[PDB]
Design an enzyme around this catalytic site. Structure first.
Site, PDB file in Angstrom:
ATOM      1  N   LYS A  13      37.966  -6.236  66.469  1.00 48.64           N
ATOM      2  CA  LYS A  13      37.257  -5.303  67.327  1.00 48.64           C
ATOM      3  C   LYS A  13      38.242  -4.571  68.214  1.00 48.64           C
ATOM      4  O   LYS A  13      38.559  -5.050  69.292  1.00 48.64           O
ATOM      5  CB  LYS A  13      36.253  -6.059  68.205  1.00 48.64           C
ATOM      6  CG  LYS A  13      35.268  -6.955  67.498  1.00 48.64           C
ATOM      7  CD  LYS A  13      34.208  -6.215  66.823  1.00 48.64           C
ATOM      8  CE  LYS A  13      33.172  -7.161  66.293  1.00 48.64           C
ATOM      9  NZ  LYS A  13      32.238  -6.466  65.376  1.00 48.64           N
ATOM     10  N   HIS A  58      50.942  -9.351  60.061  1.00 45.82           N
ATOM     11  CA  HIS A  58      50.709  -9.712  58.657  1.00 45.82           C
ATOM     12  C   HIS A  58      51.043  -8.610  57.678  1.00 45.82           C
ATOM     13  O   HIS A  58      51.256  -8.911  56.502  1.00 45.82           O
ATOM     14  CB  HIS A  58      49.255 -10.180  58.425  1.00 45.82           C
ATOM     15  CG  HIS A  58      48.872 -11.420  59.176  1.00 45.82           C
ATOM     16  ND1 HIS A  58      49.607 -12.594  59.074  1.00 45.82           N
ATOM     17  CD2 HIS A  58      47.821 -11.641  59.996  1.00 45.82           C
ATOM     18  CE1 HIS A  58      48.997 -13.483  59.864  1.00 45.82           C
ATOM     19  NE2 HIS A  58      47.915 -12.958  60.432  1.00 45.82           N
ATOM     20  N   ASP A 101      56.247 -15.443  68.209  1.00 46.03           N
ATOM     21  CA  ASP A 101      54.890 -15.230  67.781  1.00 46.03           C
ATOM     22  C   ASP A 101      54.042 -16.392  68.315  1.00 46.03           C
ATOM     23  O   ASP A 101      54.187 -17.514  67.851  1.00 46.03           O
ATOM     24  CB  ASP A 101      54.847 -15.094  66.248  1.00 46.03           C
ATOM     25  CG  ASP A 101      53.556 -14.541  65.708  1.00 46.03           C
ATOM     26  OD1 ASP A 101      52.491 -15.051  66.088  1.00 46.03           O
ATOM     27  OD2 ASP A 101      53.615 -13.604  64.908  1.00 46.03           O
ATOM     28  N   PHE A 147      62.522  -9.863  57.774  1.00 49.12           N
ATOM     29  CA  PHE A 147      63.815 -10.226  58.288  1.00 49.12           C
ATOM     30  C   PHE A 147      64.340 -11.577  57.792  1.00 49.12           C
ATOM     31  O   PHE A 147      65.219 -12.169  58.427  1.00 49.12           O
ATOM     32  CB  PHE A 147      63.816 -10.150  59.792  1.00 49.12           C
ATOM     33  CG  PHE A 147      63.445  -8.785  60.297  1.00 49.12           C
ATOM     34  CD1 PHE A 147      62.299  -8.598  61.058  1.00 49.12           C
ATOM     35  CD2 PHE A 147      64.244  -7.679  60.022  1.00 49.12           C
ATOM     36  CE1 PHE A 147      61.946  -7.332  61.511  1.00 49.12           C
ATOM     37  CE2 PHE A 147      63.905  -6.408  60.504  1.00 49.12           C
ATOM     38  CZ  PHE A 147      62.759  -6.238  61.238  1.00 49.12           C
ATOM     39  N   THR A 194      68.247 -11.848  57.059  1.00 52.08           N
ATOM     40  CA  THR A 194      69.193 -11.340  58.053  1.00 52.08           C
ATOM     41  C   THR A 194      69.272 -12.257  59.245  1.00 52.08           C
ATOM     42  O   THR A 194      68.264 -12.836  59.675  1.00 52.08           O
ATOM     43  CB  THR A 194      68.882  -9.887  58.470  1.00 52.08           C
ATOM     44  OG1 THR A 194      69.893  -9.461  59.372  1.00 52.08           O
ATOM     45  CG2 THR A 194      67.526  -9.711  59.158  1.00 52.08           C
ATOM     46  N   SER A 206      57.868 -18.570  65.211  1.00 45.40           N
ATOM     47  CA  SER A 206      56.433 -18.535  65.187  1.00 45.40           C
ATOM     48  C   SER A 206      55.899 -19.943  65.386  1.00 45.40           C
ATOM     49  O   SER A 206      56.389 -20.886  64.765  1.00 45.40           O
ATOM     50  CB  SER A 206      55.918 -17.869  63.896  1.00 45.40           C
ATOM     51  OG  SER A 206      54.499 -17.734  63.861  1.00 45.40           O
ATOM     52  N   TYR A 258      67.641 -18.666  60.657  1.00 42.13           N
ATOM     53  CA  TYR A 258      67.143 -17.614  61.550  1.00 42.13           C
ATOM     54  C   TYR A 258      65.651 -17.348  61.417  1.00 42.13           C
ATOM     55  O   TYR A 258      65.163 -16.414  61.996  1.00 42.13           O
ATOM     56  CB  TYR A 258      67.968 -16.305  61.356  1.00 42.13           C
ATOM     57  CG  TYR A 258      69.398 -16.505  61.757  1.00 42.13           C
ATOM     58  CD1 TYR A 258      70.340 -16.927  60.840  1.00 42.13           C
ATOM     59  CD2 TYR A 258      69.797 -16.340  63.071  1.00 42.13           C
ATOM     60  CE1 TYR A 258      71.653 -17.164  61.217  1.00 42.13           C
ATOM     61  CE2 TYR A 258      71.110 -16.565  63.457  1.00 42.13           C
ATOM     62  CZ  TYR A 258      72.036 -16.963  62.528  1.00 42.13           C
ATOM     63  OH  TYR A 258      73.335 -17.164  62.928  1.00 42.13           O
TER      64      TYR A 258
HETATM   65  C1  LIG Z   1      42.651 -13.532  61.202  1.00 40.43           C
HETATM   66  N1  LIG Z   1      43.844 -12.726  61.431  1.00 40.43           N
HETATM   67  C2  LIG Z   1      44.489 -12.267  60.213  1.00 40.43           C
HETATM   68  C3  LIG Z   1      44.474 -12.672  62.626  1.00 40.43           C
HETATM   69  O1  LIG Z   1      44.038 -13.216  63.633  1.00 40.43           O
HETATM   70  C4  LIG Z   1      45.783 -11.910  62.783  1.00 40.43           C
HETATM   71  N2  LIG Z   1      46.671 -12.712  63.661  1.00 40.43           N
HETATM   72  C5  LIG Z   1      45.487 -10.557  63.420  1.00 40.43           C
HETATM   73  C6  LIG Z   1      46.524  -9.499  63.205  1.00 40.43           C
HETATM   74  C7  LIG Z   1      45.991  -8.164  63.655  1.00 40.43           C
HETATM   75  C8  LIG Z   1      46.081  -7.778  64.982  1.00 40.43           C
HETATM   76  C9  LIG Z   1      45.560  -6.580  65.398  1.00 40.43           C
HETATM   77  C10 LIG Z   1      44.931  -5.748  64.493  1.00 40.43           C
HETATM   78  C11 LIG Z   1      44.825  -6.122  63.178  1.00 40.43           C
HETATM   79  C12 LIG Z   1      45.342  -7.329  62.764  1.00 40.43           C
HETATM   80 CA   LIG Z   2      52.174 -17.498  65.574  1.00 43.15          CA
HETATM   81 NA    NA Z   3      65.789 -13.506  60.251  1.00 43.52          NA
HETATM   82 ZN   LIG Z   4      45.915 -14.346  64.484  1.00 45.13          ZN
END
Ligand SMILES: CN(C)C(=O)[C@H]([NH3+])CCc1ccccc1
Ligand SMILES: [Ca+2]
Ligand code: NA
Ligand SMILES: [Zn+2]
Length: 369
Positions: free
Chosen positions: A26, A136, A169, A182, A185, A192, A217
């Site tokens: 949203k 993603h 992340d 990446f 590199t 994450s 890395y």
């Molecule tokens: C369920 N799902 C894939 C997620 O929660 C991703 N982390 C969201 C990535 C994202 C952020 C902003 C706009 C579009 C897509």
């Molecule tokens: Ca994460």
């Molecule tokens: Na890297």
């Molecule tokens: Zn997410």
């Protein structure tokens, strides 16, 4: 380390892009965020910019021409002509065709790249783009509600003036698109923290550490359901401190996906807004140029709370728990407070589990020169 200059990226159109009926993503949560932080008075302490629409050229610094050409052409009214291209590029189900899809990509991307330019020019200490963090998206494929990887593009911009860039992340999902871009590199280290096991995207095993020059890395902290502020806080600072020590980046990108909060519609973690924001505070202590991006988040009242408070943190500005009146005030009932409580859900991340993963990651970080 001082109060820092903050440049903040927002387009008033953003909240009008609509993924479709039932789709949990949203964009209106970004507008709710902006309106809330306007009503807290935080516009007084930062420069607010309307980012440019990123062009197809800018996007093709990472994405393939054919994929950007498709995103630029596909509309609901011609989807029928493009069924083969849609399947190839993974567009039409989780990543739907909606009206203004490409402009949403351009404004999401434009904020992150504009933020990176401003950091490169040393005209700001921090740049914020809550419409970004679309971790993603792949070179030639949409994924996980993401079409254009604004993060990879922003990092490529940073790499023009920074030898080493650190990406962190804290979205509940693994930052697979950024990691992949990446992976070979040592000029970008990707870190994450994410739920792992029977969970999208299926990547971000502990044992995924990079390849070639990028070996050691990529860093992944896989987690189970129900992680809380204390357990997250006990590993985020030690890990990031050791990453900073060993890697010595000159710029940082922090994806602040709010689907790691308690009560998220799609997430299974138990962080509060203070627990989430403590990550922003920790990263802020290193006094490096910092790009803060959005990400997931599906309980949209909590998303707006989270990113408002993290703007306040970026600004070193205390804000009251009593929410100010705002265009979306009713969304914040029954309490009308900024901060949230954790749930009674079980933390499946034992203290021993968190320490063991930490120690394995520390062994991998020793392997940097
Ligand atoms: C369920 N799902 C894939 C997620 O929660 C991703 N982390 C969201 C990535 C994202 C952020 C902003 C706009 C579009 C897509
Ligand atoms: Ca994460
Ligand atoms: Na890297
Ligand atoms: Zn997410």
């Amino acid at each position: 380390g001082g109060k820092k200059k903050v440049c903040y990226y927002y387009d008033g159109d953003i909240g009008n892009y609509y993924y479709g009926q039932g789709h949990p993503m949203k964009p209106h949560r970004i507008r709710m965020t902006h309106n809330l932080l306007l009503n807290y008075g935080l516009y007084r302490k930062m420069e607010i910019y309307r980012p440019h629409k990123a062009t197809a050229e800018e996007m093709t610094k990472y994405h393939s021409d054919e994929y950007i050409k498709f995103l630029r052409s596909i509309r609901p009214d011609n989807m029928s002509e493009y069924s083969k291209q849609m399947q190839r590029f993974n567009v039409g189900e989780d990543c739907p065709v909606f009206d203004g899809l490409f402009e949403f990509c351009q404004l999401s991307t434009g904020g992150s790249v504009a933020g990176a330019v401003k950091l490169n020019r040393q005209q700001t200490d921090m740049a914020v783009n809550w419409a970004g963090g679309l971790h993603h998206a792949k070179k030639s494929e949409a994924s996980g509600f993401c079409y254009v990887n604004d993060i990879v593009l922003a990092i490529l911009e940073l790499l023009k003036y920074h030898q080493r860039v650190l990406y962190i992340d804290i979205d509940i999902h693994h930052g697979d698109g950024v990691e992949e871009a990446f992976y070979t590199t040592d000029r970008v280290m990707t870190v994450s923290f994410h739920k792992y096991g029977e969970y999208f995207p299926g990547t971000g095993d502990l044992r995924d550490i990079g390849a070639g020059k990028g070996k050691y890395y990529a860093v992944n902290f896989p987690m189970r359901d129900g992680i809380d502020d204390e357990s997250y806080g006990q590993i985020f600072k030690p890990i990031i401190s050791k990453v900073m020590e060993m890697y010595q980046p000159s710029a940082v990108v922090l994806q602040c996906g709010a689907d790691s909060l308690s009560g998220d519609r799609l997430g299974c973690f138990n962080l509060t807004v203070k627990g989430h924001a403590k990550c922003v505070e920790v990263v802020k202590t290193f006094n490096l140029p910092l790009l803060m991006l959005g990400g997931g988040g599906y309980t949209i009242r909590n998303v707006a709370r989270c990113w408002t408070y993290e703007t306040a943190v970026a600004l070193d500005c205390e804000i009251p728990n009593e929410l100010p009146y705002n265009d979306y005030f009713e969304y914040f009932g029954p309490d009308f407070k900024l901060h949230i409580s954790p749930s009674n859900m079980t933390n499946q991340n034992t203290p021993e589990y968190m320490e063991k993963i930490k120690q394995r990651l520390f062994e991998n970080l020793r392997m940097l020169p």
